[PDB]
Design an enzyme around this catalytic site. Structure first.
Site, PDB file in Angstrom:
ATOM      1  N   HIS A  45       0.810  -1.184   0.000  1.00  0.00           N
ATOM      2  CA  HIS A  45       0.000   0.000   0.000  1.00  0.00           C
ATOM      3  C   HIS A  45       0.872   1.274   0.000  1.00  0.00           C
ATOM      4  CE1 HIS A  45       0.268   0.112   4.531  1.00  0.00           C
ATOM      5  NE2 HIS A  45       0.196   1.406   4.271  1.00  0.00           N
ATOM      6  N   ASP A  93      -0.200  -7.625   1.593  1.00  0.00           N
ATOM      7  CA  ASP A  93       0.308  -6.251   1.667  1.00  0.00           C
ATOM      8  C   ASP A  93       1.841  -6.258   1.792  1.00  0.00           C
ATOM      9  OD1 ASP A  93      -0.444  -3.248   3.717  1.00  0.00           O
ATOM     10  OD2 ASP A  93       0.467  -3.484   1.737  1.00  0.00           O
ATOM     11  N   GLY A 186       2.880   6.561   8.576  1.00  0.00           N
ATOM     12  CA  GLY A 186       4.299   6.768   8.353  1.00  0.00           C
ATOM     13  C   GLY A 186       5.164   5.629   8.810  1.00  0.00           C
ATOM     14  N   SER A 188       4.047   2.450   8.224  1.00  0.00           N
ATOM     15  CA  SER A 188       3.694   1.406   7.257  1.00  0.00           C
ATOM     16  C   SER A 188       4.885   0.964   6.496  1.00  0.00           C
ATOM     17  CB  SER A 188       2.723   1.939   6.227  1.00  0.00           C
ATOM     18  OG  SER A 188       1.489   2.218   6.819  1.00  0.00           O
ATOM     19  N   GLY A 189       4.962  -0.329   6.294  1.00  0.00           N
ATOM     20  CA  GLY A 189       6.035  -0.917   5.538  1.00  0.00           C
ATOM     21  C   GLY A 189       7.261  -1.256   6.304  1.00  0.00           C
TER      22      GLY A 189
END
Ligand code: NA
Length: 240
Positions: A45, A93, A186, A188-189
């Site tokens: 995402h 994801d 922020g 995320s990932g």
């Protein structure tokens, strides 16, 4: 990261900042993990938008020269083929980014170690989330890299009705949910680091939090479970 503490500058050397070009400057958008000298793992995402991305390794303070940063363009983006951007709860994801150049390894820049395929953490296993994400719900990005202790919440509990119900899948890890500490926008990932047999490994890629806020009791932060994607990751790197 809500309710975190500043990380020591050499604690999490596989953490990266994924940034996009914003006028005449660059802005942090999400985290990631260095998994080869020229590959980064992040959330799908995070790369949904058609932006110009770069990766920064060896970063600590987003707003000051650390003397340790390497900046490298993203050459290719490989998103999981089952990813669907309007259904994050379905999973998948995850994305791999091939870097334009190989980074140089040192005490600030190291490969993340991944778990063995199929590994599932026992309930309440000790883990840290790391990142530069918002420090409060509807807040602002951290300047310096943050860490927060988030013990895991097993599938049987996380998928119960007062937690996430059907929204959490077995291909995910949940951690936290105490109402004080969590991931936030922020983050995320970026990685969930869990201590197993004496060694930290990256067991999660930060995927989502509640729409009602970051740190909400019984809504632990949800991560893509890296150990469900080992074959995928290896297949992508070997074919690119
Ligand atoms: Na910096």
């Amino acid at each position: 990261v809500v309710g975190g503490t500043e990380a020591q500058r050499n604690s999490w050397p596989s953490q990266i900042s994924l940034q996009y070009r914003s006028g005449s400057s660059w802005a942090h958008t999400c985290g990631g993990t260095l998994i080869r000298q020229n590959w980064v793992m992040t959330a799908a995402h995070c790369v949904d938008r058609e932006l110009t991305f770069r990766v920064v390794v060896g970063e600590h303070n987003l707003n000051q020269n650390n003397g340790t940063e390497q900046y490298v363009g993203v050459q290719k983006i490989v998103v999981h083929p089952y990813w669907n951007t309007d259904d994050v709860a379905a999973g998948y994801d995850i994305a791999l980014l091939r870097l334009a150049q190989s980074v140089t390894l040192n005490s600030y820049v190291q490969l993340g170690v991944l778990p063995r395929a199929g590994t599932i953490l026992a309930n309440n296993s000790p883990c840290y989330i790391t990142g530069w994400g918002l420090t409060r719900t509807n807040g602002q990005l951290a300047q310096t890299l943050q860490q927060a202790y988030l013990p895991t919440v097993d599938y049987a509990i996380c998928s119960s009705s007062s937690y996430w119900g059907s929204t959490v899948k077995n291909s995910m890890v949940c951690a936290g949910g105490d109402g004080v500490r969590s991931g936030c926008q922020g983050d995320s990932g970026g990685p969930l680091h869990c201590l197993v047999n004496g060694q930290y490994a990256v067991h999660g890629v930060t995927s989502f939090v509640s729409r009602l806020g970051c740190n909400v009791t019984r809504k632990p932060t949800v991560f893509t479970r890296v150990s469900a994607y080992i074959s995928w990751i290896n297949n992508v790197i070997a074919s690119n």
